[PDB]
Amino acid sequence: NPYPDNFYVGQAIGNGSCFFDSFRQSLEQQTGEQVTAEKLRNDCREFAQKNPPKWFTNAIVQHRSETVDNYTADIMRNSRWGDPDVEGRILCEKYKVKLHVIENQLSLHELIDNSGSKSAGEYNKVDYDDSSTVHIINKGGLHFEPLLDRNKSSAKQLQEQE
């Protein structure tokens, strides 16, 4: 309903990594780039180890150095669920994509890129024909599923969905 009729809600793994798995699936369909959910967590670990800019330390917090070190361990655990505002921003920067989240609350559209998170308004309308936007749906909390495009899915993938 809050998306065009060629899009559908896919399935994500439910071991705590649904954010990473939803991002991975939309990334692969949109750009062809295959990255495992574990590799996406490792990209966030590496971001935190490599002189991260202040937005990141500000978001997750001397005390800063231990907090970053705790993050580098915790982000590799499936128990740590991913957050579009933090891990999504890191992955948008690495993969040169914009992340569109459909949030239920009515449906609100958020767009995240390497510079942070904004509501999709008149100047930042969601573009469902842009191969550099990836799409996920957030039913509540930090629960995510990929929003995929039938036009870009194999017939077998679509039968597995049905």
Author numbering: 36 to 96, 104 to 147, 154 to 210
From the study:
The wMelOTU structure exhibits a pared‐down canonical OTU domain architecture with a central β‐sheet supported underneath by an α‐helical subdomain, but although additional α‐helical content typically sandwiches the β‐sheet from above, there is very little additional support in the wMelOTU structure (and EV3B). The core of the OTU fold that contains the active site (the central β‐sheet and two most proximal supporting α‐helices) closely resembles other OTU domains such as OTUB1 (1.6 Å RMSD) and vOTU, whereas the surrounding areas of structure are more divergent (Akutsu et al, 2011; Juang et al, 2012). Two regions of structure near the S1 substrate recognition site, encompassing 6 and 7 amino acids, respectively, are missing from the electron density. The structure confirms our prediction and mutagenesis of active site residues. However, the catalytic triad is misaligned as a result of the loop preceding the general base His (the so‐called His‐loop) occupying a descended conformation that would also occlude entry of the Ub C‐terminus into the active site. Thus, while the apo wMelOTU structure validates our prediction of an OTU fold, it raised new questions as to the mechanisms of substrate recognition. Our structure of wMelOTU shows that its sequence topology matches the most typical OTU arrangement seen in OTUB1 and vOTU, and we would predict BurkOTU, RickOTU, and wPipOTU to be similar as well.
